């Protein structure tokens, strides 16, 4: 078992009718078929769940690349920092942001996320799809 294990991604959104989350311990190829849905203009935070099993780590970073077909990538990096080993998973949350809005904001976006560090370790790399819709349903 590696020292850092990424376990889950959650979109924290007070107005969502239900939990928006994905298990990151499973088959990564199957995560693409699981699309998660955000109402346009919704306020959200990205929450990354992870475990540190053996040794203090430093310089943890969450990197999130968002692709719409035919458009330059929308890139964001977030410093996560230093964490020591413990049985319970940790939770890191990005600052609050707003999903885009308007009919032209709707559609599917293809994300690729990286949980890494200062030593450029590939703790996890994974793809997931986001659908922006006019309504939650
Ligand atoms: O729209 C913008 C730029 N403008 C703003 O982000 C404004 C900032 C304040 N309101 C909106 N990027 C779009 C974008 C859409 C979805 C996400 C996304 C990713 C993960 C989780 C939830 C999300 F929503 C991120 C960015 C595009 C990406 C690629 C081509 S276009």
PDB file of C-alpha atoms and ligand atoms in Angstrom:
ATOM      1  CA  UNK A   1       0.000   0.000   0.000  1.00  0.00           C
ATOM      2  CA  UNK A   2       1.556   3.299  -1.144  1.00  0.00           C
ATOM      3  CA  UNK A   3       2.123   6.116   1.300  1.00  0.00           C
ATOM      4  CA  UNK A   4      -0.532   8.399  -0.248  1.00  0.00           C
ATOM      5  CA  UNK A   5      -3.810   6.899  -1.471  1.00  0.00           C
ATOM      6  CA  UNK A   6      -6.437   9.064  -3.183  1.00  0.00           C
ATOM      7  CA  UNK A   7      -9.854   7.672  -2.311  1.00  0.00           C
ATOM      8  CA  UNK A   8     -12.634   9.968  -3.495  1.00  0.00           C
ATOM      9  CA  UNK A   9     -13.609  13.157  -5.314  1.00  0.00           C
ATOM     10  CA  UNK A  10     -16.695  15.079  -4.175  1.00  0.00           C
ATOM     11  CA  UNK A  11     -18.301  18.212  -5.622  1.00  0.00           C
ATOM     12  CA  UNK A  12     -19.524  20.125  -2.578  1.00  0.00           C
ATOM     13  CA  UNK A  13     -22.600  22.108  -3.561  1.00  0.00           C
ATOM     14  CA  UNK A  14     -25.184  23.252  -1.034  1.00  0.00           C
ATOM     15  CA  UNK A  15     -27.945  23.494  -3.646  1.00  0.00           C
ATOM     16  CA  UNK A  16     -27.415  19.999  -5.090  1.00  0.00           C
ATOM     17  CA  UNK A  17     -30.350  17.601  -4.514  1.00  0.00           C
ATOM     18  CA  UNK A  18     -27.976  14.759  -3.663  1.00  0.00           C
ATOM     19  CA  UNK A  19     -24.359  13.766  -3.153  1.00  0.00           C
ATOM     20  CA  UNK A  20     -22.054  14.280  -6.130  1.00  0.00           C
ATOM     21  CA  UNK A  21     -19.126  11.929  -5.574  1.00  0.00           C
ATOM     22  CA  UNK A  22     -16.987   9.211  -7.161  1.00  0.00           C
ATOM     23  CA  UNK A  23     -14.955   6.326  -5.716  1.00  0.00           C
ATOM     24  CA  UNK A  24     -11.344   6.748  -6.839  1.00  0.00           C
ATOM     25  CA  UNK A  25     -10.107   3.367  -5.560  1.00  0.00           C
ATOM     26  CA  UNK A  26     -11.703   1.392  -8.405  1.00  0.00           C
ATOM     27  CA  UNK A  27     -11.224   0.824 -12.109  1.00  0.00           C
ATOM     28  CA  UNK A  28     -10.152   4.192 -13.516  1.00  0.00           C
ATOM     29  CA  UNK A  29     -11.254   3.370 -17.067  1.00  0.00           C
ATOM     30  CA  UNK A  30     -14.854   2.997 -15.805  1.00  0.00           C
ATOM     31  CA  UNK A  31     -14.904   6.448 -14.175  1.00  0.00           C
ATOM     32  CA  UNK A  32     -15.448   8.063 -17.584  1.00  0.00           C
ATOM     33  CA  UNK A  33     -18.870   6.408 -17.983  1.00  0.00           C
ATOM     34  CA  UNK A  34     -19.885   7.847 -14.594  1.00  0.00           C
ATOM     35  CA  UNK A  35     -20.701  11.457 -15.395  1.00  0.00           C
ATOM     36  CA  UNK A  36     -21.627  13.888 -12.629  1.00  0.00           C
ATOM     37  CA  UNK A  37     -24.026  16.783 -13.102  1.00  0.00           C
ATOM     38  CA  UNK A  38     -23.882  20.435 -12.042  1.00  0.00           C
ATOM     39  CA  UNK A  39     -26.624  22.987 -12.575  1.00  0.00           C
ATOM     40  CA  UNK A  40     -25.284  25.982 -14.480  1.00  0.00           C
ATOM     41  CA  UNK A  41     -24.165  28.857 -12.271  1.00  0.00           C
ATOM     42  CA  UNK A  42     -23.949  26.551  -9.240  1.00  0.00           C
ATOM     43  CA  UNK A  43     -21.528  27.405  -6.449  1.00  0.00           C
ATOM     44  CA  UNK A  44     -19.269  24.468  -5.671  1.00  0.00           C
ATOM     45  CA  UNK A  45     -16.017  23.299  -4.166  1.00  0.00           C
ATOM     46  CA  UNK A  46     -13.958  20.328  -5.278  1.00  0.00           C
ATOM     47  CA  UNK A  47     -13.189  18.018  -2.348  1.00  0.00           C
ATOM     48  CA  UNK A  48     -10.389  15.441  -2.603  1.00  0.00           C
ATOM     49  CA  UNK A  49     -10.306  12.615  -0.042  1.00  0.00           C
ATOM     50  CA  UNK A  50      -6.992  10.893   0.554  1.00  0.00           C
ATOM     51  CA  UNK A  51      -5.056   8.801   3.033  1.00  0.00           C
ATOM     52  CA  UNK A  52      -1.478   9.146   4.281  1.00  0.00           C
ATOM     53  CA  UNK A  53      -0.359   5.746   5.508  1.00  0.00           C
ATOM     54  CA  UNK A  54       3.253   5.773   6.654  1.00  0.00           C
ATOM     55  CA  UNK A  55       5.295   8.976   6.490  1.00  0.00           C
ATOM     56  CA  UNK A  56       4.748  12.719   6.575  1.00  0.00           C
ATOM     57  CA  UNK A  57       4.501  14.095   3.048  1.00  0.00           C
ATOM     58  CA  UNK A  58       5.000  17.661   1.878  1.00  0.00           C
ATOM     59  CA  UNK A  59       4.065  19.702  -1.147  1.00  0.00           C
ATOM     60  CA  UNK A  60       0.853  17.865  -2.051  1.00  0.00           C
ATOM     61  CA  UNK A  61      -0.836  19.491  -5.058  1.00  0.00           C
ATOM     62  CA  UNK A  62      -4.172  18.977  -6.811  1.00  0.00           C
ATOM     63  CA  UNK A  63      -4.108  19.770 -10.565  1.00  0.00           C
ATOM     64  CA  UNK A  64      -7.335  19.840 -12.579  1.00  0.00           C
ATOM     65  CA  UNK A  65      -7.509  20.165 -16.371  1.00  0.00           C
ATOM     66  CA  UNK A  66     -10.917  20.690 -17.967  1.00  0.00           C
ATOM     67  CA  UNK A  67     -11.473  20.116 -21.698  1.00  0.00           C
ATOM     68  CA  UNK A  68     -14.320  21.068 -23.974  1.00  0.00           C
ATOM     69  CA  UNK A  69     -13.813  19.593 -27.433  1.00  0.00           C
ATOM     70  CA  UNK A  70     -12.201  22.157 -29.730  1.00  0.00           C
ATOM     71  CA  UNK A  71     -11.220  24.616 -26.967  1.00  0.00           C
ATOM     72  CA  UNK A  72      -7.952  25.274 -25.142  1.00  0.00           C
ATOM     73  CA  UNK A  73      -7.725  23.537 -21.776  1.00  0.00           C
ATOM     74  CA  UNK A  74      -8.908  25.293 -18.604  1.00  0.00           C
ATOM     75  CA  UNK A  75      -6.179  24.519 -16.036  1.00  0.00           C
ATOM     76  CA  UNK A  76      -6.107  25.033 -12.266  1.00  0.00           C
ATOM     77  CA  UNK A  77      -3.523  24.056  -9.630  1.00  0.00           C
ATOM     78  CA  UNK A  78      -4.195  24.017  -5.876  1.00  0.00           C
ATOM     79  CA  UNK A  79      -1.560  23.634  -3.168  1.00  0.00           C
ATOM     80  CA  UNK A  80      -2.646  20.961  -0.668  1.00  0.00           C
ATOM     81  CA  UNK A  81       0.436  20.916   1.536  1.00  0.00           C
ATOM     82  CA  UNK A  82       1.835  18.712   4.311  1.00  0.00           C
ATOM     83  CA  UNK A  83       0.074  15.788   6.043  1.00  0.00           C
ATOM     84  CA  UNK A  84       1.131  13.083   8.481  1.00  0.00           C
ATOM     85  CA  UNK A  85       0.037   9.433   8.553  1.00  0.00           C
ATOM     86  CA  UNK A  86      -3.222   8.476  10.279  1.00  0.00           C
ATOM     87  CA  UNK A  87      -6.029   5.915   9.837  1.00  0.00           C
ATOM     88  CA  UNK A  88      -8.772   8.380   8.872  1.00  0.00           C
ATOM     89  CA  UNK A  89      -8.764   9.943   5.434  1.00  0.00           C
ATOM     90  CA  UNK A  90      -8.091  13.652   5.012  1.00  0.00           C
ATOM     91  CA  UNK A  91     -10.308  16.061   3.056  1.00  0.00           C
ATOM     92  CA  UNK A  92      -8.923  18.944   0.989  1.00  0.00           C
ATOM     93  CA  UNK A  93     -11.335  21.520  -0.461  1.00  0.00           C
ATOM     94  CA  UNK A  94     -10.677  24.076  -3.184  1.00  0.00           C
ATOM     95  CA  UNK A  95     -12.016  27.619  -2.707  1.00  0.00           C
ATOM     96  CA  UNK A  96     -15.639  28.224  -3.668  1.00  0.00           C
ATOM     97  CA  UNK A  97     -16.135  28.763  -7.397  1.00  0.00           C
ATOM     98  CA  UNK A  98     -19.129  29.278  -9.688  1.00  0.00           C
ATOM     99  CA  UNK A  99     -19.911  26.981 -12.595  1.00  0.00           C
ATOM    100  CA  UNK A 100     -20.390  28.864 -15.894  1.00  0.00           C
ATOM    101  CA  UNK A 101     -23.897  29.832 -16.924  1.00  0.00           C
ATOM    102  CA  UNK A 102     -26.048  30.337 -19.984  1.00  0.00           C
ATOM    103  CA  UNK A 103     -27.059  27.961 -22.740  1.00  0.00           C
ATOM    104  CA  UNK A 104     -23.537  28.072 -24.205  1.00  0.00           C
ATOM    105  CA  UNK A 105     -22.130  26.873 -20.869  1.00  0.00           C
ATOM    106  CA  UNK A 106     -24.172  23.659 -20.972  1.00  0.00           C
ATOM    107  CA  UNK A 107     -22.749  20.365 -22.180  1.00  0.00           C
ATOM    108  CA  UNK A 108     -20.133  17.793 -21.266  1.00  0.00           C
ATOM    109  CA  UNK A 109     -16.624  18.699 -20.136  1.00  0.00           C
ATOM    110  CA  UNK A 110     -13.844  16.111 -19.947  1.00  0.00           C
ATOM    111  CA  UNK A 111     -11.657  16.541 -16.863  1.00  0.00           C
ATOM    112  CA  UNK A 112      -8.297  15.016 -16.085  1.00  0.00           C
ATOM    113  CA  UNK A 113      -7.115  15.382 -12.489  1.00  0.00           C
ATOM    114  CA  UNK A 114      -3.734  14.782 -10.872  1.00  0.00           C
ATOM    115  CA  UNK A 115      -2.880  14.357  -7.205  1.00  0.00           C
ATOM    116  CA  UNK A 116       0.880  14.872  -7.011  1.00  0.00           C
ATOM    117  CA  UNK A 117       3.553  16.623  -4.958  1.00  0.00           C
ATOM    118  CA  UNK A 118       6.841  18.515  -5.055  1.00  0.00           C
ATOM    119  CA  UNK A 119       8.679  15.316  -6.056  1.00  0.00           C
ATOM    120  CA  UNK A 120       6.276  14.978  -9.037  1.00  0.00           C
ATOM    121  CA  UNK A 121       4.879  11.695  -7.673  1.00  0.00           C
ATOM    122  CA  UNK A 122       1.824  10.274  -9.462  1.00  0.00           C
ATOM    123  CA  UNK A 123      -0.344   9.596  -6.439  1.00  0.00           C
ATOM    124  CA  UNK A 124      -3.340   9.400  -8.767  1.00  0.00           C
ATOM    125  CA  UNK A 125      -4.210  10.534 -12.292  1.00  0.00           C
ATOM    126  CA  UNK A 126      -7.826  10.103 -13.337  1.00  0.00           C
ATOM    127  CA  UNK A 127     -10.396  11.205 -15.911  1.00  0.00           C
ATOM    128  CA  UNK A 128     -14.007  12.145 -15.194  1.00  0.00           C
ATOM    129  CA  UNK A 129     -16.783  13.892 -17.088  1.00  0.00           C
ATOM    130  CA  UNK A 130     -18.785  16.894 -15.928  1.00  0.00           C
ATOM    131  CA  UNK A 131     -22.181  17.762 -17.423  1.00  0.00           C
ATOM    132  CA  UNK A 132     -23.504  21.301 -16.994  1.00  0.00           C
ATOM    133  CA  UNK A 133     -27.285  21.449 -17.383  1.00  0.00           C
ATOM    134  CA  UNK A 134     -30.081  24.002 -17.116  1.00  0.00           C
ATOM    135  CA  UNK A 135     -31.619  22.082 -14.179  1.00  0.00           C
ATOM    136  CA  UNK A 136     -30.426  19.345 -11.848  1.00  0.00           C
ATOM    137  CA  UNK A 137     -32.435  16.607 -13.593  1.00  0.00           C
TER     138      UNK A 137
HETATM  139  O1  LIG B   1     -16.129  29.019 -18.120  1.00  0.00           O
HETATM  140  C1  LIG B   1     -14.960  28.851 -17.976  1.00  0.00           C
HETATM  141  C2  LIG B   1     -14.058  30.019 -17.585  1.00  0.00           C
HETATM  142  N1  LIG B   1     -14.848  30.940 -16.797  1.00  0.00           N
HETATM  143  C3  LIG B   1     -15.204  30.564 -15.446  1.00  0.00           C
HETATM  144  O2  LIG B   1     -14.850  29.524 -15.003  1.00  0.00           O
HETATM  145  C4  LIG B   1     -16.065  31.546 -14.607  1.00  0.00           C
HETATM  146  C5  LIG B   1     -15.583  31.748 -13.407  1.00  0.00           C
HETATM  147  C6  LIG B   1     -16.874  32.216 -12.600  1.00  0.00           C
HETATM  148  N2  LIG B   1     -18.105  31.549 -13.341  1.00  0.00           N
HETATM  149  C7  LIG B   1     -17.592  30.890 -14.370  1.00  0.00           C
HETATM  150  N3  LIG B   1     -14.364  27.542 -18.157  1.00  0.00           N
HETATM  151  C8  LIG B   1     -15.154  26.395 -18.542  1.00  0.00           C
HETATM  152  C9  LIG B   1     -15.265  25.445 -17.338  1.00  0.00           C
HETATM  153  C10 LIG B   1     -16.385  24.644 -17.217  1.00  0.00           C
HETATM  154  C11 LIG B   1     -16.505  23.793 -16.116  1.00  0.00           C
HETATM  155  C12 LIG B   1     -15.502  23.761 -15.165  1.00  0.00           C
HETATM  156  C13 LIG B   1     -15.641  22.832 -13.964  1.00  0.00           C
HETATM  157  C14 LIG B   1     -14.676  21.878 -13.713  1.00  0.00           C
HETATM  158  C15 LIG B   1     -14.810  21.056 -12.606  1.00  0.00           C
HETATM  159  C16 LIG B   1     -15.899  21.178 -11.752  1.00  0.00           C
HETATM  160  C17 LIG B   1     -16.862  22.137 -12.007  1.00  0.00           C
HETATM  161  C18 LIG B   1     -16.726  22.968 -13.115  1.00  0.00           C
HETATM  162  F1  LIG B   1     -17.667  23.917 -13.356  1.00  0.00           F
HETATM  163  C19 LIG B   1     -14.379  24.568 -15.283  1.00  0.00           C
HETATM  164  C20 LIG B   1     -14.271  25.423 -16.381  1.00  0.00           C
HETATM  165  C21 LIG B   1     -14.411  25.777 -19.709  1.00  0.00           C
HETATM  166  C22 LIG B   1     -13.502  24.716 -19.674  1.00  0.00           C
HETATM  167  C23 LIG B   1     -12.948  24.389 -20.950  1.00  0.00           C
HETATM  168  C24 LIG B   1     -13.421  25.200 -22.010  1.00  0.00           C
HETATM  169  S1  LIG B   1     -14.506  26.309 -21.336  1.00  0.00           S
END
